[PDB]
DNA sequence: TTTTTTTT
C-alpha cells in the first residue's frame, strides 16, 4: 500500500543547495550574481524565460567540493528526474525573486491590476504558476568538458530516436535529427480562473493534464457563506495562458540501421521556445523525456503501455557579430578573397577554377530588386552545367549543396515535377487536399541541385520554368488556389545528348534544351573533357594525393573552412551595392555588341542562341555579386568586364576546341 | 462608480471622454494628429466630424458607426480610451455603443427634431472601429494577444452559410403553461429550476421551446494570411473568422479585405459526451469592422479633366505598366480589357457580355509574365496562376463536402483572370476553359452535382510559340499551334517578337539600367487610375452608333472577304464599346471602331503579316 | 460509387 522506499536524495537539501547556487553563483571565471541579474531582469519583466545551465551547476559543484561540501551533485541529479527539479528551481527562483527595478511592465497587466485588488478584497491562496511569468529552462551539459567522463556515459551525446530507451523516461536527453513536421502554435492554460457573481470570488483551477473537466460549482466561501450554489464562469483574461506547439523529429538516414524504417518522436514545446524550430532542418534538441498519459477509456484500453513524448529544454542548430567581424577582416586583409574562396571551393576537385568562381558568384546571389512602380526582378542566379559524363559535375553539386546552409540536393528521375515544386496530398486527414512544399519550397532562400537535368521530364522542366524566372509558385490545383513566394537559387547538371558533346553537332543541338529554358539560366557552362597528357598527369597526381592523403595536396594554396565561407558569404550578401552610370554605358554597349553578334551569328557552328534582355539582367546580377564579394558599395566596371569574361569563357570553351 | 473589472478603466470617465469625443471633436483634431497642416480645410477640419456623421446617420437611420483609431488618438480625452479599447475591447465597445445611442437620443431631443425617439431607443447603435493597430502577421499571433483588437489583412478563402446564433432562450411551463425568456449569457442558458410563477413553481416543468426562442445570425469565413505577411518557410495560414449581424454575408470568396476584430479563444470538448475540455483552446476572431481592399465631386472633376486630356488613351496605356518599356499597343489592349465592354443582358437570346479576352503568345523574355503580374495587381478581383500548377478541376469547380469548391475562374467572376504559361497548360483543361469563357458561365454535370455557375470574367493568357522563338518560317497559326476554336475564343492576340533593333535595344537597356541606378525607383496615380476605370464601368455605358454599326458591318465584311468568325465581329464590337468607355462615352463612335480594327491588326501584326503563307516578315515586323 | 491528385 504505497510502501515507502528510501532513496539517496533529500529535496530539502537539494533545494537549499539550489538557492545557495542561484544567489551565490556568478560567471566570475568567464568575467551581482548572473542568476540574480537574470532574476532582476525578470523583475523588470525584461525576460520571461530562464535558462539554468547544467554546466554552471557543475562549476558551482566543483567550487563547493574544492571548498569542501556535502555536495548533492545537483548537475547529475537533474538528469535522473528533471521535471520535479524544474519545479524546485522555479520555487527557489520565486523565493529568491528580487523586487522590481526601474519601471515595472505592469502598466495594464490584468493580473497585477486585479491580483492586488483580489487581495484587498481578501484583506497558497492562488497557484504560484498564475503569478509566475518566467519560463524556466535548462541548457544541456557542454560535451567539450565531459568532466563527468565515467559519469558522462553519453549524456550530451545526441541519440537517434531508436537510440532512445524507456529507461531514459523522466530524464533529460539529447537527440539529433530532422524536424519532419511542425504544428501551428496554439494556446494552453496553466491555470484556469472561474468567476461567479454570487461569491464575487475568482477561484483558480490549475490544470496539468492534457484535458480537464470544468468545476461548474463554487467551493468559494462567499457562496458557501450565504449557502448559495455558485454558477462559475470561465474568465480567459483571468485564466493563465501559454503558447504551445508540437514538432516531430525523425531519424537521420545515417542514424537509421540498414533495412530499418526511420523512427520519429513527437516533441512538445511551450513558452518562449515555441516556433524556434523549423521543419525539415537538422537540429540537436535537449529536453525532458516523459510519458504521455491517456484519456480514461483509451487508458483502460492501453493499460500499462504508455505513449511518450519530449519536452525540449533547449535547441541547437547545426547551422543558421563582432567576433564574426574580426574573423572576416582577417580574410579581407589576407586579400584576393574572391580567388582564394573559389579555390577553397571543392578542394577535392582539381582545376575548373573558373567554374568554382562562377559557383561562388551564384552562392552570394545577385541583388533582389523591387521598383516603385511595383516591378520586382529576380536577383537570384541560375547556372547550368552541360558536359561530358564523369567530369565531377555531380560531385561539385553535392559539395555546393553541403556548403550552402539551406542547400538541397535532388535528381531529376528521383524527383517528380509536382514533388519538386509542390504536391497536393488528397488525404492527409479527412480526405482534404493539402498543398505540400516541394523540393524548391525546401530550397527557399537556398540552392537546389538538380542532376541529370537533361534526363528530367520536359513537362516538369516547363514546370520549373515558372519558379526559376519568377520566384513565386502559383498553384490552382483542385481545392487549392494559392501562391508561394518560393525564392531560391537553381543549379542544374546535365550532359550533351548522346551522353557527350559532338563537335559536328551545333552547341544548341548538343544542349538540346528549350530556348526559353536556356535563356532563363543566367549562365550555361560547356565544360568538356579532352585527353591532355600533361593535364591528365596533373589531375591524376592531385587525385592520387587525395587518395593517399585525405587532405588535397596543398599545392601552395590555403583553403578557408566551411563555417568561415558561410559566415563571409552572409556578410557579403548583406551589402546590396548600387551601380554607376559609366558602368551603364559600358554594359549597354556590350549588350548591343552581343545582340549584333547573335543577329549575325546564327551559324550552327557558332550559334549559342539569340541574346535576350534576361542575358543583360544576368550580367547585371553577376556584376552585383562580384561587388558583393569585393564588398564595394557600388558595382565597378571591373566587375562588369569580369562577368563578360566569365560568359565569354563559358562560350569559348567549345570554340577553343 | 462604474469601472471595468481588472483594468481600472472607469466606465463613467470612459463614457464622459468618449462623449466629448463624439461632440466637440473637430476633424481638425484628426488632421492635426496626422499633421498635414498644408492640407487642412477649415470646413472639414473645423467640422465636428462625428457630430456631422451622427446627423447624416440619423438621416440615413443606420445603427453602425465606422470609427478609425486616429480620431481616438487625436482627442486627448479619448486618447487613453484608445489604449483601453486596444487592451480590453469588448467592454469598451459596449460602453461606446451605449454612449453613441445616448448621444443620438440627446441630439434628437436637444435639436427637437421630429424623430421617433423610440426608434433610436430601438436602434441598437454600434461602433465599427477600424485601424485599431498596425497590421500584424496573423502567424505572429500569440496567446496573450487574446482579448484584443488585431487589425488583420488577408484573402477570403471561403465563407459558411449563415448559422442560427442563439440569442435569447424562451421557456414554458408544462403544467400551467406560464412562459419565461432566458437571455443567453456567455453563450449558455441558466434554466429556471422551478416555474417563475410562485403559484405553480413546478420544478423542471420549464421547457425550452426552440422555435419560440430568439436566435441571431452568425457566419464564419476562412481568411488566408497574405503572402506579404508570411515567411518563405511555410505555407500561409488561414483563420475562420466568425462574423455576425449585418457583417454576415458581407463578402464573397477571393476578397482581399482588411478587418479589425477582437482576438478570441475558447475551449473545445475533448469528449462530446463529457464536459472534459482539451487543454489547448480553439481560437477565432470576431470582426468588429471590415475593410474592402464614393467618387467625390472632386474625384469626378479629376476624372473628367483627365478625360479631357487627349493623351488619355496613351496616358492610361503607359500608366497601367509604368515600369514596362514600350509595348504601348499591348498596354492599350489590356487597358481596354480592364475597361471591358457593355453587358447588354438581353431579355431574350441570353445575355451578351462585353468581355474582352487577350492572349499573349510570343518569344519569351518579353516581360509577358511581368505584364500578367501587373494586370493581376491592378484588377481588384485578380486571379493569377500557371497552367502547370493549375488543374481544370481547381481552375473552375472542385467537388467537396457534398459541396463544390470555387475554381480560379469562379474567383475571377466579375474580374480579371491571369493564366501564366497558358500554352503549357493542358489541352484537356484548355477544352474545359473553352466553353466557360465562351458562355461566361461554368456548367457542371456530375453524379449528384449537376448545375451551372456564373463565370463572367476576363482572362489574360500568356503563351509561347510552339517554336520557343516564334519562327517566321512557320505560319503564325503554326507558330502558336493552338486550337482554332480556342484561338477564336480569344479576342486579341499580341505576337510579341524580340526583333534585334539596335536602337530599341539601346533604349530598353537605358531604361533597365536607369531602373538599376535608383535603389528604389507621366502616369496616372494607380489609385486614381482605378477610380477612373471603376467610375467608367459603373456610370458610363457605351451604346452602338449608326456610323459605328455601318463601319462595323463594312469592316467585318472585308475581314470575312479576306478567317473572320462572327466572334471577330463581336470582338470588334465589344472593343469599340470598351474604347468609348475609356473615352467616358455612353455612345459608341466610328473612331472607336477604327481603333478596334487598328489594334486588331496591330496585335496580330497584320501590317507585317504575309498576305499568303500565314507567315509574317520579321523585317516588316517593327519595320 | 464518384471524384480526384498523385504516383506507378
Ligand atoms: N577534376 C576532378 N577532380 C576530382 N575528381 C574528379 C575530377 N574529374 C572527375 N573526378 C572524379 O571522377 C568522377 C566523375 O564522375 P562523378 O563525379 O560521379 O559524376 P560526373 O559524371 O562527373 O558528373 P555528372 O555527369 O553530373 S553525374 C568522380 O568520382 C569524381 O570524383
Ligand atoms: N519591353 C520590355 N520592357 C521591360 N522589360 C522587358 C521588356 N521585354 C522584356 N523585358 C524583361 O525581360 C524579362 C522577361 O520576363 P518574362 O515576363 O518571363 O518575359 P515573357 O514575355 O513572359 O516571356 P516568357 O515568360 O519567358 S514565355 C523580364 O525581366 C522583363 O522585365
Ligand atoms: Mg556527377
Ligand atoms: Mg514571363
Ligand atoms: Zn460563486
Ligand atoms: Zn408553471
Distance CA(A611)–CA(B365), nearest Å, equals: 10
Give the DSSP H or E segment for B372.
helix B368-378
B370 ligand 2 Cβ < 6 A: yes
Distance CA(B417)–CA(A478), nearest Å, equals: 17
Residues 474-493 of A with CB under 7 A from strand C: 477-478
Residue A81 three-state SS: coil
Residue A164 three-state SS: coil
The shortest C-alpha distance from B351 to chain A (Å) reads: 28
Distance CA(A338)–CA(A334), nearest Å, equals: 11
List phi, psi (to 5°) of B587: -130, 140
Distance CA(B14)–CA(B96), nearest Å, equals: 8
Burial of B50 (0-12, 13-18, 19+ CB in 10 A): buried
| DSSP-assigned letter for residue B566 | H
Residue B222 region by backbone torsions, left for phi larger than 0, else alpha for psi between -120 and 50, else beta: beta
Q: Are A266 and A210 in contact (CB under 8 A)?
A: no
Q: Are B333 and B492 in contact (CB under 8 A)?
A: yes
> Measured from the CA of A465, which atom of ligand 2 is nearest?
26
First to last CA, chain B: 85
Q: Which of residues 150-189 of A touch B (CB under 8 A)?
A: 182, 184-189
Q: Are A94 and A128 in contact (CB under 8 A)?
A: yes
Give the closest residue to A313 by CA, choosing from A345, A268, A247, A278.
A268
The shortest C-alpha distance from B132 to chain A (Å) reads: 17
Q: Are B418 and B383 in contact (CB under 8 A)?
A: yes
Alpha helices in A211-336 (DSSP H): 221-225, 296-302, 322-334
Q: State the number of CA atoms in the 13 A half-sphere of A371 facing the CB.
A: 19
Distance CA(A202)–CA(A199), nearest Å, equals: 8
Give the closest residue to A54 by CA, choosing from A25, A96, A23.
A25
Contact A481 B510 (CB under 8 A): no
Match 541541385 to its residue by C-alpha cell. Answer: A449
Distance of CA A618 to the CA centre of its chain: 29
Q: What is the DSSP string of B423-446?
A: TTS-HHHHHHHHHHHHHTEEEEEE
Strands (DSSP E) contained in B256-388 are: 256-266, 277-278, 282-292, 344-345, 351-352, 358-361, 382-386
Measured in angstroms, how far is the CA atom of residue A307 from the centroid of ligand 1? 48
Match 477640419 to its residue by C-alpha cell. Answer: B45
> Measured from the CA of A351, which atom of ligand 1 is nearest?
1
For residue A440, CA distances in Å to A377, A443, B229, B233 come to 19, 5, 20, 11
Q: Are A604 and B499 in contact (CB under 8 A)?
A: no
For residue A212, CA distances in Å to A172, B267, B283, B511 come to 27, 10, 18, 66
Q: State the number of CA atoms in the 13 A half-sphere of A87 facing the CB.
A: 9
Give the closest residue to A38 by CA, choosing from A55, A26, A28, A54.
A26
Q: Are B460 and B368 in contact (CB under 8 A)?
A: no
A386 ligand 1 Cβ < 6 A: no
Distance CA(A272)–CA(A274), nearest Å, equals: 5
List phi, psi (to 5°) of A621: -60, -45
Q: What is the CA radius of gyration of chain A?
A: 32
Match 442558458 to its residue by C-alpha cell. Answer: B189
Distance CA(B436)–CA(A303), nearest Å, equals: 59
Residue A497 three-state SS: coil
| DSSP-assigned letter for residue A394 | H
**How many degrees, rounded to 5, is the angle at CA B227 between CA B222 and CA B231?**
110
Identity of the residue in B227, B421, B515 whose CB atom sits nearest the CB atom of A483:
B227
| Positive or negative torsion for Cα A563, A566, A572, A575 | negative
Whether the beta carbon of B386 falls within 7 A of nucleic chain C: the reply is no
Instruction: Please name the residues in contact with A401: beta carbons below 8 A apart, sequence gap of 6 or more.
Output: A407, A408, A409, A447, A449
Cβ-based contacts of A293 with chain B (< 8 Å): none
* Method used experimentally: cryo-EM
Give the closest residue to B378 by CA, choosing from B421, B415, B341.
B415
* Residue B366 known to bind ligand: yes
Alpha helices in A303-411 (DSSP H): 322-334, 337-344, 353-364, 393-403
Residue A485 touches partner B, C-beta closer than 8 Å: yes
- Identify the bridge partners of residue A525 per DSSP, sorted by sequence position: A385
Identity of the residue in A238, A587, A612 whose CB atom sits nearest the CB atom of B498:
A612
For the domain that residue A582 is a member of, what is the CATH number?
3.40.50.300
Distance CA(B567)–CA(B572), nearest Å, equals: 9
Residue A101 touches partner B, C-beta closer than 8 Å: no
List phi, psi (to 5°) of B235: -70, 150
Strands B282-292 and B179-183: unpaired
> Measured from the CA of A393, which atom of ligand 1 is nearest?
23
Q: What is the dihedral of CA B52, B58, B59, B62, to 10 degrees?
A: 110
Match 522506499 to its residue by C-alpha cell. Answer: A5
Q: Are B238 and B223 in contact (CB under 8 A)?
A: yes
Q: Are A354 and A622 in contact (CB under 8 A)?
A: no
Distance CA(B424)–CA(B389), nearest Å, equals: 10
Q: What is the DSSP string of B379-396?
A: SSSEEEEESTTB-HHHHH
Give the DSSP H or E segment for A623.
helix A613-630
Burial of A600 (0-12, 13-18, 19+ CB in 10 A): exposed
> Measured from the CA of A612, which atom of ligand 2 is nearest?
12
Q: List the grid coordinates of B525.
A: 496615380
- The protein residue nearest C3 (Cα–C1') is B399
Give the closest residue to A159 by CA, choosing from A151, A148, A171.
A171
Q: Domain of residue A353: give its range.
A: 321-650
List phi, psi (to 5°) of A539: -65, -40
| Positive or negative torsion for Cα B261, B262, B263, B264 | negative
Q: List the grid coordinates of A394.
A: 555531380
Q: List the grid coordinates of A354.
A: 573558373
Instruction: Please name the residues in contact with A255: beta carbons below 8 A apart, sequence gap of 6 or more.
Output: A160, A161, A162, A163, A176, A177, A262
Q: How many CB atoms lie within 10 A of CB A144?
A: 8
Distance CA(A404)–CA(A406), nearest Å, equals: 6
Distance of CA A252 to the CA centre of its chain: 16
For residues B148-179, b (16+ Cβ closer than 10 Å) or e, as one string? bbbbbbbbbbbbeeeeebbeebbbbbeeeebb
Residue B340 three-state SS: coil
Distance of CA A99 to the CA centre of its chain: 38
Length of chain B: 623
Measured in angstroms, how far is the CA atom of residue A402 from the centroid of ligand 3? 15
- The protein residue nearest C2 (Cα–C1') is B447
Q: Are A614 and A520 in contact (CB under 8 A)?
A: yes
Q: Which of residues 370-409 of A touch B (CB under 8 A)?
A: 370-375
Q: How many CB atoms lie within 10 A of CB B393?
A: 18
Distance CA(A501)–CA(A282), nearest Å, equals: 39
Distance CA(A606)–CA(A604), nearest Å, equals: 5
Q: Are A502 and A496 in contact (CB under 8 A)?
A: yes
Burial of A527 (0-12, 13-18, 19+ CB in 10 A): buried
For residues B23-47, b (16+ Cβ closer than 10 Å) or e, as one string? eebbbbbbbeeeeeeeeeeeeebeb
> Measured from the CA of A390, which atom of ligand 1 is nearest?
21
Contact B394 A476 (CB under 8 A): yes
Cβ-based contacts of B323 with chain A (< 8 Å): 371, 373-375
Q: Are B387 and B421 in contact (CB under 8 A)?
A: yes
* Residue B365 known to bind ligand: yes
Q: Are A152 and A267 in contact (CB under 8 A)?
A: no
SS (H, E, C) B508-564: HHHHHHHHHHCCCCCCCCHHHHHHHHHHHHHHCCCCCCHHHHHHHHHHHHHHHHCCC
Distance CA(B218)–CA(A295), nearest Å, equals: 33
Strand order, beta sheet including A408-411: A408-411, A447-451, A489-494, A382-386, A523-525
**How many degrees, rounded to 5, is the angle at CA B333 between CA B330 and CA B336?**
150
Q: How many CB atoms lie within 10 A of CB B515?
A: 17
| DSSP-assigned letter for residue A347 | S
Distance CA(B415)–CA(B410), nearest Å, equals: 10
Round and report the angstrom distance from CA (B431) to C1' (C3).
Answer: 19
Instruction: Please name the residues in contact with A109: beta carbons below 8 A apart, sequence gap of 6 or more.
Output: none
Declared resolution, Å:
4.1
Strands B126-130 and B64-68: parallel
Q: State the number of CA atoms in the 13 A half-sphere of A107 facing the CB.
A: 6
Measured in angstroms, how far is the CA atom of residue A319 from the centroid of ligand 1? 28
Question: Percent helix, strand, coil in chain A (nearest 5)?
Answer: 40, 20, 40
Residue B145 region by backbone torsions, left for phi larger than 0, else alpha for psi between -120 and 50, else beta: alpha
Contact A476 B385 (CB under 8 A): yes
Q: List the grid coordinates of A164.
A: 532512445
Q: Are A22 and A50 in contact (CB under 8 A)?
A: no
Distance of CA B279 to the CA centre of its chain: 38
Distance CA(A562)–CA(A574), nearest Å, equals: 18
Report the largest interatomic distance among the alpha carbons of chain A, rounded to a whole angstrom. Answer: 106
Round and report the angstrom distance from CA (A461) to C1' (C8).
Answer: 20
Distance CA(B67)–CA(B127), nearest Å, equals: 7
Distance CA(B514)–CA(A587), nearest Å, equals: 12
Distance CA(A409)–CA(B494), nearest Å, equals: 40
B514 ligand 2 Cβ < 6 A: no
For residues A539-559, b (16+ Cβ closer than 10 Å) or e, as one string? eeebbebbeeeeebbeeeeeb
* Residue B550 known to bind ligand: no
From A346, A354, A394, give the residue whose CB has the most ligand 1 atoms within 8 Å, as the site to mutate. Answer: A394
Q: How many CB atoms lie within 10 A of CB A640?
A: 23
- Identify the bridge partners of residue B493 per DSSP, sorted by sequence position: B359
Residue B3 three-state SS: strand
Q: List the grid coordinates of B326.
A: 514600350
List phi, psi (to 5°) of B211: -60, -50
Give the closest residue to A154 by CA, choosing from A166, A141, A170.
A141
Residue B503 region by backbone torsions, left for phi larger than 0, else alpha for psi between -120 and 50, else beta: alpha
Distance CA(B512)–CA(A377), nearest Å, equals: 11
Measured in angstroms, how far is the CA atom of residue B370 from the centroid of ligand 2? 6
Match 466610328 to its residue by C-alpha cell. Answer: B590
Measured in angstroms, how far is the CA atom of residue A553 from the centroid of ligand 3? 22
Give the closest residue to A360 by CA, choosing from A632, A631, A622.
A622
Distance CA(A83)–CA(A136), nearest Å, equals: 11
In strand C, the nucleotides that come within 7 Å of a protein beta carbon are: 1-8
Q: State the number of CA atoms in the 13 A half-sphere of A494 facing the CB.
A: 24
Give the DSSP H or E segment for A533.
helix A533-548
Q: List the grid coordinates of A308.
A: 511518450
Q: Are B418 and B458 in contact (CB under 8 A)?
A: no
Distance CA(B419)–CA(B422), nearest Å, equals: 6
Q: Are A519 and A544 in contact (CB under 8 A)?
A: no
Contact B513 A587 (CB under 8 A): yes
| DSSP-assigned letter for residue A405 | T
Name which of B86, B376, B386, B413 to mutate to probe chain A: the one with the most chain A Cβ atoms within 10 A of its Cβ.
B386
Residue A410 three-state SS: strand
Distance CA(B414)–CA(B404), nearest Å, equals: 19
Q: List the grid coordinates of A208.
A: 496539468
Residue A351 three-state SS: coil
Report the largest interatomic distance among the alpha carbons of chain B, rounded to a whole angstrom. Answer: 104
Q: Are A522 and A618 in contact (CB under 8 A)?
A: yes
For residue B296, CA distances in Å to A251, B30, B67, B300, B550 come to 64, 20, 20, 6, 38
Whether the beta carbon of A434 falls within 7 A of nucleic chain C: the reply is no
Measured in angstroms, how far is the CA atom of residue B171 from the centroid of ligand 6? 11
Match 561562388 to its residue by C-alpha cell. Answer: A360
Residue A268 touches partner B, C-beta closer than 8 Å: no
Residue nearest to atom 21 of ligand 1 (CA): A390
Length of chain A: 657
Whether the beta carbon of A457 falls within 7 A of nucleic chain C: the reply is no
Contact A477 B383 (CB under 8 A): no
Whether the beta carbon of B447 falls within 7 A of nucleic chain C: the reply is yes
Ligand nearest to the CA of A226: 5
Instruction: Please name the residues in contact with A223: beta carbons below 8 A apart, sequence gap of 6 or more.
Output: A196, A198, A199, A201, A229, A230
Q: List the grid coordinates of A212.
A: 480537464
The shortest C-alpha distance from A76 to chain B (Å) reads: 33
Residue A426 three-state SS: coil
Amino acid at each position: 500500500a504505497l510502501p515507502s522506499i528510501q532513496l539517496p536524495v533529500d529535496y530539502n537539501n537539494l533545494f537549499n543547495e539550489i538557492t545557495d547556487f542561484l544567489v551565490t553563483f556568478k560567471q566570475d571565471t568567464l568575467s551581482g550574481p548572473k542568476y540574480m541579474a537574470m532574476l532582476q531582469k525578470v523583475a523588470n519583466r525584461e525576460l520571461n524565460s530562464v535558462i539554468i545551465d547544467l554546466d554552471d551547476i557543475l562549476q558551482y559543484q566543483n567550487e563547493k567540493f574544492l571548498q569542501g561540501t556535502q555536495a548533492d551533485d545537483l548537475v547529475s541529479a537533474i538528469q535522473q528526474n528533471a521535471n520535479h527539479f524544474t519545479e524546485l528551481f522555479c520555487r527557489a527562483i520565486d523565493n529568491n525573486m528580487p523586487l522590481p527595478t526601474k519601471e515595472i511592465d505592469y502598466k495594464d497587466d490584468v493580473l497585477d491590476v486585479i491580483l492586488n485588488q483580489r487581495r484587498l478584497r481578501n484583506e497558497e491562496l492562488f497557484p504560484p504558476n498564475l503569478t509566475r511569468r518566467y519560463f524556466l529552462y535548462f541548457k544541456p551539459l557542454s560535451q567539450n568538458c565531459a568532466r563527468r567522463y565515467r559519469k558522462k556515459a553519453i549524456s550530451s551525446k545526441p541519440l537517434s530516436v531508436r537510440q532512445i530507451k524507456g529507461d531514459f523516461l523522466g530524464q533529460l536527453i539529447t537527440v539529433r535529427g530532422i524536424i519532419t513536421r511542425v504544428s501551428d502554435v496554439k494556446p494552453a492554460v496553466e491555470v484556469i480562473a472561474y468567476t461567479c457573481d454570487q461569491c464575487g470570488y475568482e477561484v483558480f483551477q490549475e490544470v496539468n493534464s492534457r484535458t480537464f473537466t470544468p468545476l461548474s460549482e463554487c467551493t468559494s466561501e462567499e457562496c458557501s457563506q450565504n449557502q448559495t450554489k455558485g454558477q462559475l464562469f470561465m474568465s480567459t483574461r483571468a485564466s493563465k495562458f501559454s503558447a504551445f506547439q508540437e514538432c516531430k523529429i525523425q531519424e537521420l538516414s545515417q542514424q537509421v540501421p540498414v533495412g530499418h524504417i526511420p523512427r520519429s518522436l513527437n516533441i512538445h514545446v511551450n513558452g518562449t521556445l515555441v516556433r524556434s524550430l523549423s521543419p525539415g532542418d537538422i537540429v540537436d534538441v535537449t529536453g525532458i523525456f516523459l510519458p504521455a498519459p491517456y484519456t480514461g477509456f483509451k487508458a483502460l484500453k492501453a493499460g500499462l503501455l504508455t505513449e511518450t513524448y519530449l519536452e525540449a529544454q533547449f535547441v541547437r542548430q547545426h547551422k543558421k557579430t563582432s567576433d564574426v567581424e574580426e574573423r572576416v577582416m582577417e580574410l579581407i586583409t589576407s586579400g584576393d578573397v574572391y580567388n582564394r574562396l573559389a579555390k577553397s571551393i571543392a578542394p577535392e576537385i582539381y582545376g575548373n577554377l573558373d567554374v568554382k568562381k562562377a559557383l561562388l558568384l551564384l552562392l552570394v546571389g545577385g541583388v533582389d530588386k523591387r521598383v516603385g512602380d511595383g516591378m520586382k526582378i529576380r536577383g537570384d542566379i541560375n547556372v547550368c552545367l552541360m558536359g561530358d559524363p564523369g567530369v565531377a559535375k555531380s560531385q561539385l553539386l553535392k559539395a555546393i549543396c553541403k556548403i550552402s546552409p539551406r542547400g538541397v540536393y535532388t535528381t531529376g528521375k528521383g524527383s517528380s515535377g509536382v514533388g519538386l515544386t509542390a504536391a497536393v496530398m488528397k488525404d492527409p486527414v479527412t480526405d482534404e487536399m493539402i498543398l505540400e512544399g516541394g523540393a524548391l519550397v525546401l530550397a527557399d532562400n537556398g540552392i537546389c541541385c538538380i542532376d541529370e537535368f537533361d534526363k528530367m521530364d520536359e513537362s516538369d522542366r516547363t514546370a520549373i520554368h515558372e519558379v526559376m524566372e519568377q520566384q513565386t509558385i502559383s498553384i490552382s490545383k483542385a481545392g487549392i488556389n494559392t501562391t508561394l513566394n518560393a525564392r531560391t537559387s537553381i543549379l542544374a547538371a546535365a550532359n550533351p545528348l548522346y551522353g557527350r558533346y559532338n563537335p559536328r553537332l551545333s552547341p544548341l543541338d548538343n544542349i538540346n534544351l528549350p530556348a526559353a529554358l536556356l535563356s532563363r539560366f543566367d549562365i550555361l557552362f560547356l565544360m568538356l573533357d579532352i585527353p591532355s597528357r600533361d593535364d591528365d598527369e596533373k589531375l591524376a597526381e592531385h587525385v592520387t594525393y587525395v587518395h593517399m592523403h585525405n587532405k588535397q595536396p596543398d599545392l601552395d594554396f590555403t583553403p578557408v573552412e566551411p563555417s568561415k565561407m558561410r559566415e563571409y558569404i552572409a556578410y557579403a550578401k548583406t551589402k546590396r551595392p548600387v551601380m554607376s552610370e559609366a558602368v551603364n554605358d559600358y554594359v549597354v554597349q556590350a549588350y548591343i555588341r552581343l545582340r549584333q553578334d547573335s543577329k549575325r551569328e546564327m551559324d550552327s557552328k557558332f550559334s549559342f542562341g539569340q541574346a535576350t534582355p534576361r542575358t543583360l539582367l544576368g550580367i547585371i546580377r553577376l556584376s552585383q555579386a562580384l561587388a558583393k564579394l569585393r564588398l564595394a558599395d557600388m558595382v565597378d566596371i571591373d566587375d562588369v568586364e569580369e562577368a563578360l569574361r566569365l560568359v565569354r569563357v563559358s562560350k569559348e570553351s567549345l570554340y577553343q576546341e | 462608480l462604474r469601472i471595468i473589472w481588472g483594468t481600472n478603466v472607469s466606465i463613467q470617465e470612459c463614457t464622459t471622454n468618449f462623449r466629448n469625443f463624439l461632440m466637440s471633436f473637430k476633424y481638425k483634431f484628426r488632421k492635426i494628429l496626422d499633421e498635414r497642416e498644408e492640407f487642412i480645410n477649415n470646413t472639414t477640419d473645423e467640422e465636428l466630424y462625428y457630430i456631422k456623421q451622427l446627423n447624416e446617420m440619423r438621416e440615413l437611420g443606420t445603427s453602425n458607426l465606422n470609427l478609425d483609431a486616429r480620431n481616438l488618438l487625436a482627442y486627448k480625452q479619448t486618447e487613453d480610451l484608445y489604449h483601453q479599447l486596444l487592451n480590453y475591447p469588448q467592454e469598451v465597445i459596449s460602453i461606446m455603443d451605449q454612449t453613441i445611442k445616448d448621444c443620438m437620443v440627446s441630439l434628437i431631443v436637444d435639436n427637437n427634431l421630429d424623430y421617433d425617439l423610440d426608434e433610436i431607443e430601438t436602434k441598437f447603435y454600434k461602433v465599427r472601429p477600424y485601424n485599431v493597430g498596425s497590421c500584424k502577421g496573423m502567424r505572429e499571433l500569440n496567446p496573450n494577444d487574446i482579448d484584443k483588437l488585431i487589425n488583420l489583412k488577408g484573402l477570403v478563402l471561403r465563407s459558411t452559410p449563415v448559422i442560427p446564433d442563439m440569442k435569447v432562450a424562451f421557456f414554458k411551463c408544462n403544467v400551467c403553461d406560464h412562459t419565461m425568456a432566458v437571455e443567453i449569457d456567455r453563450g449558455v442558458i441558466q434554466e429556471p429550476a422551478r416555474c417563475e410563477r410562485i403559484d405553480c413553481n413546478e420544478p423542471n416543468s420549464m421547457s425550452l421551446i426552440h422555435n419560440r426562442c430568439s436566435f441571431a445570425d452568425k457566419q464564419v469565413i476562412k481568411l488566408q494570411e497574405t503572402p506579404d505577411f508570411v515567411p518563405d518557410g511555410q505555407t500561409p495560414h488561414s483563420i475562420s473568422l466568425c462574423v455576425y449581424d449585418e457583417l454576415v454575408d458581407s463578402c464573397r470568396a477571393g476578397d482581399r479585405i482588411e478587418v479589425t476584430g477582437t482576438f478570441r479563444s475558447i475551449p473545445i470538448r475533448a469528449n462530446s459526451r463529457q464536459r472534459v475540455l482539451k487543454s489547448l483552446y480553439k481560437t477565432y476572431v470576431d470582426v468588429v469592422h471590415v475593410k474592402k481592399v464614393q467618387i467625390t465631386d472632386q474625384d469626378l472633376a479629376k476624372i473628367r479633366e483627365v478625360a479631357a486630356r487627349e493623351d488619355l488613351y496613351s496616358l492610361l496605356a503607359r500608366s497601367i505598366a509604368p515600369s514596362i518599356y514600350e509595348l504601348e499597343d499591348v498596354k492599350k489592349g489590356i487597358l481596354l480589357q480592364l475597361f471591358g465592354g457593355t453587358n447588354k443582358t438581353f431579355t431574350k437570346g441570353g445575355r451578351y457580355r462585353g468581355d474582352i479576352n487577350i492572349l499573349l503568345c510570343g518569344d519569351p523574355s518579353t516581360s509577358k509574365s511581368q505584364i500578367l503580374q501587373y494586370v493581376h495587381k491592378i484588377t481588384p478581383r485578380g486571379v493569377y496562376t500557371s497552367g502547370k500548377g493549375s488543374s481544370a478541376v481547381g481552375l473552375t469547380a472542385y467537388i467537396t463536402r457534398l459541396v463544390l469548391e470555387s475554381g480560379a475562374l469562379v474567383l475571377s467572376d466579375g474580374g480579371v483572370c491571369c493564366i501564366d504559361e497558358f500554352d503549357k497548360m493542358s489541352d484537356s483543361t484548355r477544352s474545359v476553359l473553352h466553353e466557360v469563357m465562351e458562355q461566361q458561365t461554368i456548367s457542371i454535370a456530375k453524379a449528384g452535382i449537376i448545375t451551372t455557375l456564373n463565370a463572367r470574367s476576363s482572362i489574360l493568357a500568356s503563351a509561347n510559340p510552339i517554336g520557343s522563338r516564334y519562327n517566321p518560317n512557320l505560319p503564325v497559326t503554326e507558330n502558336i499551334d493552338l486550337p482554332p476554336p480556342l484561338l477564336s475564343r480569344f479576342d486579341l492576340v499580341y505576337l510579341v517578337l524580340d526583333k534585334v533593333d539596335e536602337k530599341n535595344d539601346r533604349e530598353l537597356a537605358k531604361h533597365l539600367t536607369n531602373l538599376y541606378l535608383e535603389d528604389k525607383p507621366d502616369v496616372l496615380p494607380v489609385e486614381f487610375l482605378t477610380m477612373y476605370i471603376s467610375y467608367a464601368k459603373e456610370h458610363i455605358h457605351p451604346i452602338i452608333t449608326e456610323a459605328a454599326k455601318t463601319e462595323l458591318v463594312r469592316a467585318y465584311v472585308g475581314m470575312r472577304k479576306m478567317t473572320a468568325t462572327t466572334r471577330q465581329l463581336e470582338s470588334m464590337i465589344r472593343l469599340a464599346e470598351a474604347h468609348a468607355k475609356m473615352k467616358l462615352k455612353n455612345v459608341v463612335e466610328l473612331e472607336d471602331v477604327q481603333e478596334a480594327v487598328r489594334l486588331i491588326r496591330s496585335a496580330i501584326k497584320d501590317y507585317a503579316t504575309d498576305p499568303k503563307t500565314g507567315k509574317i516578315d520579321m523585317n516588316l515586323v517593327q519595320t
